[PDB]
């Protein structure tokens, strides 16, 4: 930290540029000089105002301070699941609490993005989709098919807590009840909605109508695995106890708890342990389910104005042809195409709640930047490490749009 300039001195720039400020303490960037008076943002969400407040309290805590040093992780991009399982489950929680140093073996936040897509792959029988259209994930009760899973839940929990610990977002959509369960809150019929819509519809109908003559249920529940139905008693001798309008309320209470928590009690326990090793139970509960969801997944909604406003240029001007076309091309794309462009440049499709001004780089806050490099014949390259895109100065729109759409496709 250099002091002030001697009286009468002044700084100037060889080229036209705007100066912003990077706070490495809170990992944010702003247009306002901290040495200058800064008015509060007017017209801001009362729910984000408090979330803003809560996160500040949260992150600035004894257990949420990085231990000076560095935790090294080395994995192959084509086998990141098994490789990460070793690298992570080998190291102790305290070692994971020190600055992350991820490297990919073979070629030498995108690591978290790739890992999420693998941890929550239904093929592994750890997590499963809710129904078959909306792909929000919940825990697969049939995880027992692989005697190793209990460790993998502890591992998946570690990654989830680790991501939260280091400002890293996970690209996964948990069911509503799962966020409440992580806060150790109580789960009700309302939460059955997101978990299982079919069960919700049926259970809700029972409480609104008579069942004596229309239904012949018992205090049991049947879940089918591998084309084979297995039934379980809700209470001792449940499958032998008839369900009537007298004890229907008791049946509904029992079924919801089963279908949600009791059904995965063992797997969720292993998962909840791994998560707590990094994020202490007593300090997570400061957030509700909506606020916790943002702290894990972040925002997937890409805004063009926010994006454009907080972009740096290396060798370019915002008024340059190629840049003008770049934003025209970006504006025309949908939210999936834009998120695909992000994945390409930063390695993840998630965005901090505050916006692009707080976009995270490998060594801290790194604003989206477009560099003037590469020949017009070549495709655009990207340095994920710096949230930067090497953009050749194409002389026509169509070519740019084509080379751009290709590069983001090549990387998948």
């Amino acid at each position: 930290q250099l002091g002030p300039l001697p009286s009468g001195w002044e700084m100037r720039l060889t080229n036209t540029a705007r100066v912003y400020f990077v706070d490495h303490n809170t990992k944010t960037t702003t247009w306002d000089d901290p040495r200058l008076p800064s008015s509060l943002d007017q017209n801001v969400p009362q729910y984000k105002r408090d979330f803003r407040r809560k996160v500040i309290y949260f992150r600035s805590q004894p257990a949420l301070r990085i231990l000076p040093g560095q935790c090294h992780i080395k994995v192959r991009r084509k086998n990141i699941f098994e490789d990460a399982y070793q690298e992570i489950m080998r190291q102790t929680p305290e070692d994971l609490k020190k600055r992350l140093m991820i490297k990919f073996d073979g070629e030498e936040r995108e690591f978290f993005f790739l890992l999420s897509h693998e941890m929550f792959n239904p093929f592994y029988c750890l997590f499963e989709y809710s129904a078959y259209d909306n792909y929000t994930i919940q825990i697969n009760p049939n995880s027992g098919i692989n005697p190793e899973h209990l460790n993998y839940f502890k591992f998946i929990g570690r990654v989830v807590g680790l991501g939260v610990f280091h400002r890293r977002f996970l690209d996964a959509f948990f069911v509503g009840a799962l966020y409440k369960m992580m806060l150790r809150k109580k789960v009700v019929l309302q939460d059955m909605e997101g978990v299982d819509a079919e069960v919700y519809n049926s259970l809700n109908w029972m409480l609104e109508n008579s069942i004596d003559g229309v239904l012949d249920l018992t205090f049991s529940a049947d879940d089918e695995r591998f084309g084979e139905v297995v039934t379980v008693d809700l209470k001792p001798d449940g499958r032998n106890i008839e369900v009537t309008d007298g004890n229907k309320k008791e049946y509904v209470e029992l079924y919801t708890q089963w279908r949600i928590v009791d059904r995965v009690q063992e797997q969720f326990k292993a998962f909840m342990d791994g998560f707590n090793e990094l994020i202490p139970e007593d300090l997570v509960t400061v957030f509700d389910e909506r606020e916790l969801e943002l702290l894990i997944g972040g925002i997937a909604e890409i805004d063009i104005e926010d994006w454009k406003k907080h972009t740096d240029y290396r060798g370019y001007q915002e008024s340059d042809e190629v840049i003008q076309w770049f934003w025209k091309c970006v504006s025309e794309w949908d939210n999936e195409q834009r998120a695909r462009l992000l994945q390409f440049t930063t390695g993840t499709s998630r965005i901090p709640v505050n916006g692009f001004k707080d976009l995270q780089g490998s060594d801290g806050p790194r604003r989206f930047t477009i560099e003037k490099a590469g020949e017009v014949q070549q495709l655009p390259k990207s340095h994920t490490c710096f949230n930067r895109v090497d953009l050749p100065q194409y002389v026509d729109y169509d070519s740019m749009k084509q080379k751009l759409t290709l590069a983001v496709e090549e990387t998948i």
Partner: protein, 74 residues
């Protein structure tokens, strides 16, 4: 005949095999279009995991029989 293999994503793939083919032959046909190592493959029929060395005749697997594929771990 022709058999069906259901994945945990809700999708099912059609596979052509006679009731004398080995299980590892079925897995190699799965990798042939899904790119999944027969090593990581778990084939479940009627709630029972199958053995590579055995055939389809051992488990009296007829046509349109649905097998369930699951991935191993470590």
């Amino acid at each position: 005949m022709q058999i069906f293999v259901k994945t945990l994503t809700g999708k099912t793939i059609t596979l052509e095999v006679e009731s004398s083919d080995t299980i590892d032959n079925v897995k190699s046909k799965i990798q042939d279009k899904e790119g999944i190592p027969p090593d990581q493959q778990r084939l479940i029929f009627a709630g029972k995991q199958l053995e590579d060395g055995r055939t389809l005749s051992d488990y009296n697997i007829q046509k349109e029989s649905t097998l369930h594929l699951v991935l191993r771990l470590r």
